[PDB]
Design a protein around this ligand. Structure first.
Ligand code: HEC
Ligand code: HEM
Ligand code: HEM
Ligand code: HEM
Ligand code: HEM
Lengths: 379, 62, 49, 64, 106, 26, 241, 81, 22, 109, 54
């Protein structure tokens, strides 16, 4: 070759994973969440760096600082609310991503699914720490209750919770730590995302039908670059629709109250992206049992590849699993509802059944349904 | 016969990408101004007298 | 054998300007590229804003 | 001035009349058996709601 | 002792077979298979005819998926015509690998 | 070498004499 | 575990997506806060920056902010010899420091109204229905004098003196100062101190919505333009067979 | 290491395509959409809808009870007695 | 060759870009 | 290949630039500054993140903050003086790097 | 750059943020640097190719 810009620079060749790569033809709109997922990481990042251009990480100021970012600083208001709302998007998008590989057998790519899982739980920590930075009532108490949930571990726990906090409570110590970790996790995450993409570039993307598309492969550049741009268009639409017309709507917490350590919102709860886990945690009487169960809710994901029973990696051609699949999402929705509910009889009893129904759907129902379907097809 | 509006537009401005981009630069300018103007006006209309712009009179120069 | 080939009826998918089995597309399609490129130049001009 | 009138009107509607009967019995039940733990507050809580829904819509066209 | 029960499964099986829409796409049960290592070797063992056919049917399929359109009612795959053409090939491949595994015990 | 080095970097988080000063003193 | 009554979606000029704040309301309300409320509740993040936001001129607010620094002035902040003039000074803290503030109101701590609207669950509606909500204790109920009964407080009791009453103050123009009329104006000024960006943001919304209605359709066409070849495509299979 | 010349083997398949500038991008969209959207929604609805319907009932009942048991302060046990 | 006339419209674009955009 | 760990994972192959790579024989001690260069980048970072685990970025405090890192915080003193000094090294190393490039014409690349 | 007329808080927090984020960006660069260098290997004191000695 001569003057083929792409392969000339070795570096520029590496970028032809966007332009020349084999892309399946058929391909639901669902896939656009991978790309969108990465737009969200970049958005969050630029926003973060501008917010962290005018934020301070101290008990005294933090609150003020954020409050100053939204009032005297020029266009810091949208930057901050874009930031907050963004993260909602980032999660909404992540849970579409996981649903699509729960449905279509994308998780077949073991390697790629274990990086995903790492990705998902990294992004979870970042969102947990970033919400406390502001240092508002909700934040303050939420980080106490969660962190302390770690003190359920029998031998260490207790010592360990105090290490993490850098003291006996959540004072300055802890709030600067979160600022530092929040800032450096998304930069570590970016390398994982690229390691994720790496593996996934070795086998290409699955499809609705669940079958190899090597017989029908499209250039990513011509087609997918427009689709992606279009998906951004809608993505930003939702971000701005949220951030411009209903700033607070999706940010349940109304606690714009500076944290007072004796004071408590009797209604303490993580934002929407964590509710599922929360509800599953309350269903167990015992503290430790809850924490394990909390972990398993999320960590349960890596086990699905082993759980797969069918011969059709595609759910598309399998009724019964489509039916339980959907239920689990609606069970998931049910559990998110419990998260903002008084922890009283009515919700208790519901949540408990929901929590068992979630684990059933993942651990026992679906697996069986997989077999059945195989035996109906005579497979 | 004459060229459709688009064909005229085409051959004057969009054959050469140099002219095309020139266009776009120009366009982006002109557009911004009319949008704003028109978009602003629309918005102010919907809140007549609710905005300081409307209300400055009251305490201004006596 | 490779002569009993026909290209399929595209009449539904094509358009007004170049639907004329028996007439020139050269003096039709001058505009057709304009109109498509017009769309591009507009988008790129709004986005720029 | 404004507020005070519109409130009354609102409690003059057939659904306000109807649900004020629970307030009336409440108040008397409670005042006569004063030692009881019965809350008349809880009874009032239904009336108020229905009064106020109404109030809102009308009361607004009256202010500046 | 299956006379009434197993002459009725065909009814659920038939039900189920059209339920799963792959029916409609022009595909057949063998083309829906998860392509794994054993399936892969069975595939390779297919005749030009058998084999090229699978390529077209998946070609036509992935084309419909891409456009979200179903094939005409007249042109669908009918359960009574279950070409289990992969089965034969697929069996052996497994057969051979089971043996190999077993021969490796001790 | 590694052991102390690592240990110092973790105690750096454990609990600052600043805070710990007030601990247990009421 | 007491039922809590909830705020109406009270008719507000701004309830709507494009609706904006009514400054005259702001203006009025401001005075309400300043005369009715300055006494116990603070607004720390509010500077004497109404100018354009409240239609008070810079001379108007300068003056308005001068007298507040002459009486409450930086002598409560720690500027020994400070008097009239300055504009970067924030609204004057009712008391030296919170502990005092509870003593003046007997254990209770007058919440900073800066963010009340956005802080407490339920927005301006709640704030309006609280102030305007004060009814008779319920048969068989007991009340410590501070514990006035309010129909909309979580615990069904608040330490709040006559928040607002008819003819509490007087506005420049002549707006009829009704308990409620005043509260409509007070809430609005609060809405604003809670979210100063309220109008600009709605304004951008409009811009974002028109634009987005031009890009969404435009970019869609671009998507079909390209992909058309594929979706217009037809296939043929001709084995030698 | 090459993704385009190495995917798979395909014999005897002819493909016919047309250029973007010769066709229309929006092919009887209303017409196709209605029928196609209709036809697949109706093949989705049964598989998808249910569980959500379920949730809704659960939601509704679930909230009723709460408000009752809690608002029915006298619910548990009566007043007169 | 065509580079002058093309470099001159690329010239112009940058200029109008800056001018406007900045 | 089978069970050649290195090229199995594609990722782990990318790491064989360290182990398997063609490296010239003859090679002054000067080239160790590349590697050390990275060493320093990694040390500053680990150090930075811990200091920025107890530092505040305000007029009032910043001086105090550093002062507090070096006094009350356990092993914060070395971390900070390791971070300061490091950066010296980092530069001392950098300028060896560029010297070498200047002298042997590595800059041909 | 200063965020005002002098170097008060505004500037001080900016440097904190850019100091923090530069090194991460720089690591990407380093690796990019390494990438290019891996395509022609390390020169020597003699100045001649060593391909005959590796
Ligand atoms: C002096 C006393 C005043 C004045 C002039 C106003 N308030 Fe307001 N307020 C006061 C106290 C002592 C308390 C504490 C209540 C308690 O702990 O029971 C309050 C409380 C409020 C609230 C309640 C919010 C909540 O905690 O849920 C609100 C919304 C409130 N105060 C607002 C408010 C406004 C808008 C006023 C001007 C019209 C106002 N208060 C006057 C004491 C006092
Ligand atoms: C995708 C990863 C990220 C997620 C999920 C995330 C999320 C969040 C969230 C949920 C908050 C709380 C805001 C509020 O509710 O007020 C927050 C705040 C903050 N984040 Fe991020 N963030 C991410 C990346 C970053 C990055 C890369 C930076 C800096 C480079 C950053 C800097 C900040 C700062 C400084 C704040 C505090 C100011 C504020 O409250 O907005 N974040 N972040
Ligand atoms: C930071 C978050 C993430 C980013 C930025 C990201 C990025 C991407 C991108 C760009 C693609 C290619 C396009 C696509 O298939 O949509 C993709 C595919 C994939 N991702 Fe994600 N990812 C993220 C999180 C996850 C999670 C949480 C999982 C699952 C646990 C995961 C697993 C997968 C899988 C399995 C695929 C391949 C599916 C297929 O195309 O057949 N990813 N990822
Ligand atoms: C090679 C890249 C870097 C270099 C050259 C460098 C250099 C420096 C220098 C010269 C100082 C001043 C210290 C003094 O004399 O007191 C400093 C301070 C600081 N650096 Fe780094 N640094 C780098 C990377 C980082 C990173 C990656 C972080 C965070 C992860 C960081 C966080 C800090 C903090 C918080 C301070 C302030 C407290 C102090 O003075 O120690 N730096 N840095
Ligand atoms: C962030 C700072 C840097 C890092 C981490 C870094 C890293 C490396 C490493 C690991 C090597 C391979 C080993 C060696 O030859 O020593 C290398 C080689 C090289 N570096 Fe750097 N470097 C940095 C800065 C620079 C600078 C500032 C330049 C010149 C302006 C430079 C130019 C070179 C060249 C020319 C070589 C190849 C020499 C040869 O072997 O013929 N490096 N670098």
């Amino acid at each position: 070759m001569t003057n083929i810009r792409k392969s000339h620079p070795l570096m520029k060749i590496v970028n032809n994973a966007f332009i020349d790569l084999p892309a399946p033809s058929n391909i639901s709109s669902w896939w656009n969440f991978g790309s969108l997922l990465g737009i969200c990481l970049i958005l969050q990042i630029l926003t973060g760096l501008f917010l962290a251009m005018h934020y301070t990480s101290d008990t005294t100021t933090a609150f003020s600082s954020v409050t100053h970012i939204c009032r005297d600083v020029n266009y810091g208001w949208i930057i901050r609310y874009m930031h907050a709302n963004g993260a909602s998007m980032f999660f909404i998008c992540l849970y579409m991503h996981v649903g699509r590989g729960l449905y279509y057998g994308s998780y077949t790519f073991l390697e790629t699914w274990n990086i995903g899982v790492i990705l998902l739980l990294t992004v979870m920590a970042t969102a947990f720490m970033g919400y406390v930075l502001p240092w508002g009532q909700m934040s303050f108490w939420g980080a106490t209750v969660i962190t302390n949930l770690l003190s359920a571990i029998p031998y260490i726990g207790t010592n360990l919770v105090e290490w993490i906090w850098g003291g006996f409570s959540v004072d300055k110590a802890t709030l600067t730590r979160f600022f530092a970790f929040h800032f450096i996790l998304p930069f570590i995450i970016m390398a994982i995302a690229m390691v994720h993409l790496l593996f996934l570039h070795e086998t290409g993307s699955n499809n609705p039908t669940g079958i190899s598309s090597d017989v029908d492969k499209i250039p990513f550049h011509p087609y997918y670059t427009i689709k992606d741009i279009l998906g951004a268009l809608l993505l930003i639409l939702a971000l701005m629709l949220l951030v411009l017309f209903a700033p607070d709507l999706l940010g349940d917490p109304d606690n714009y109250t500076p944290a007072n350590p004796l004071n408590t919102p009797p209604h303490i709860k993580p934002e929407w992206y964590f509710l599922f886990a929360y509800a599953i945690l309350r269903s167990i009487p015992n503290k430790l049992g809850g924490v394990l169960a909390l972990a398993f809710s999320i960590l349960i994901l890596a086990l699905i590849p082993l759980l797969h029973t069918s011969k059709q990696r595609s759910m598309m051609f399998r009724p019964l699993s489509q039916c339980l699949f959907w239920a689990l999402v609606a069970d998931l929705l049910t559990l998110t509802w419990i998260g903002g509910q008084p922890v009283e009889h009515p919700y208790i009893t519901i949540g408990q059944l929901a929590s068992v129904l979630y684990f059933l759907l993942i651990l026992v129902l679906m697996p069986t349904a997989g077999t059945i379907e195989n035996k109906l097809l005579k497979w | 016969v004459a060229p459709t509006l688009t064909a005229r537009l085409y051959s004057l401005l969009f054959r050469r990408t140099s002219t095309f981009a020139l266009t776009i630069v120009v366009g982006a300018l002109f557009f911004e101004r009319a949008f704003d103007q028109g978009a602003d006006a629309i918005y102010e209309h919907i809140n007549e007298g609710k905005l300081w712009k409307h209300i400055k009179h009251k305490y201004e120069n006596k | 054998s490779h002569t009993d080939i026909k290209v399929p009826d595209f009449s539904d998918y094509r358009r007004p300007e170049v639907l004329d089995s028996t007439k020139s597309s050269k003096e039709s399609s001058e505009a057709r590229k304009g109109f498509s490129y017009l769309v591009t130049a507009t988008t790129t001009v709004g986005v720029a804003y | 001035d404004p507020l005070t009138t519109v409130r009354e009107q609102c409690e003059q509607l057939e659904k306000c009349v109807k649900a004020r009967e629970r307030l009336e019995l409440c108040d008397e039940r409670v005042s006569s058996r004063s030692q009881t733990e019965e809350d008349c507050t809880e009874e009032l809580l239904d009336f108020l709601h229905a009064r106020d829904h109404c109030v809102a819509h009308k009361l607004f066209n009256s202010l500046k | 002792a299956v006379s009434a029960s197993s002459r009725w499964l065909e009814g659920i099986r038939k039900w189920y077979y059209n339920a799963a829409g792959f029916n409609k796409l022009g595909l057949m049960r063998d083309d829906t298979i998860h392509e794994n290592d054993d399936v892969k070797e069975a595939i390779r063992r297919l005749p030009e005819n058998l084999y090229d056919d699978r390529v077209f049917r998946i070609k036509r399929a992935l084309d419909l998926s891409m456009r979200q359109q179903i094939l005409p009612k007249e042109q669908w795959t009918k359960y009574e015509e279950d070409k289990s053409y992969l089965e034969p090939y697929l069996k052996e491949v497994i057969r051979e690998r089971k043996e190999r595994e077993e021969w490796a015990k001790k | 070498a590694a052991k102390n080095v690592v240990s110092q970097f973790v105690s750096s988080m454990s609990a600052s004499a600043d805070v710990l000063a007030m601990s247990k003193i009421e | 575990s007491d039922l809590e009554l909830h705020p109406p979606s009270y008719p507000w000029s701004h309830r709507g997506l494009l609706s904006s704040l009514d400054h005259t309301s702001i203006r009025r309300g401001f005075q309400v806060y300043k005369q009715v409320c300055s006494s116990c509740h603070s607004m720390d993040y509010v500077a004497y920056r109404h100018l354009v936001g409240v239609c008070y001129t810079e001379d108007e607010a300068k003056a308005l902010a001068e007298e507040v620094e002459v009486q409450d002035g930086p002598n409560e902040d720690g500027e020994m010899f400070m008097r009239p003039g300055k504009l970067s000074d924030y609204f004057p803290k009712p008391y030296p420091n919170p502990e005092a503030a509870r003593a003046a109101n007997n254990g209770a701590l007058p919440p900073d109204l800066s963010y009340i609207v956005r802080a407490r669950h339920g927005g301006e509606d709640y704030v309006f229905s609280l102030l305007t909500g004060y009814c008779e204790p319920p048969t068989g109920v007991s009340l410590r004098e501070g514990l006035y009964f309010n129909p909309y407080f979580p615990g069904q009791a608040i330490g709040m003196a006559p928040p607002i009453y008819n003819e509490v103050l007087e506005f420049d123009d002549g707006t009829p100062a009704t308990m409620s009329q005043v509260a409509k104006d007070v809430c609005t000024f609060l809405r604003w101190a809670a979210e100063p960006e309220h109008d600009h943001r709605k304004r951008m919304g409009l811009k974002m919505l028109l634009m987005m209605g031009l890009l969404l359709p435009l970019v869609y066409a671009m998507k079909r333009h390209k992909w058309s070849v594929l979706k217009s495509r037809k296939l043929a299979y001709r084995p030698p067979k | 290491g090459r993704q385009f010349g190495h995917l798979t083997r395909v014999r005897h398949v002819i493909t016919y395509s047309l250029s973007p500038f010769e066709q229309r991008a929006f092919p009887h969209y209303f017409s196709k959409g209605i029928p196609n959207v209709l036809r697949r929604t109706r093949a989705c609805i049964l598989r998808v809808a249910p569980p959500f319907v379920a949730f809704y009932l659960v939601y509704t009942w679930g909230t009723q009870e709460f408000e009752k048991s809690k608002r029915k302060n006298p619910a548990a046990y009566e007043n007169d007695r | 060759r065509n580079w002058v006339p093309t470099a001159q419209l690329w010239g112009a674009v940058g200029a109008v870009g800056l001018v406007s955009a900045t």
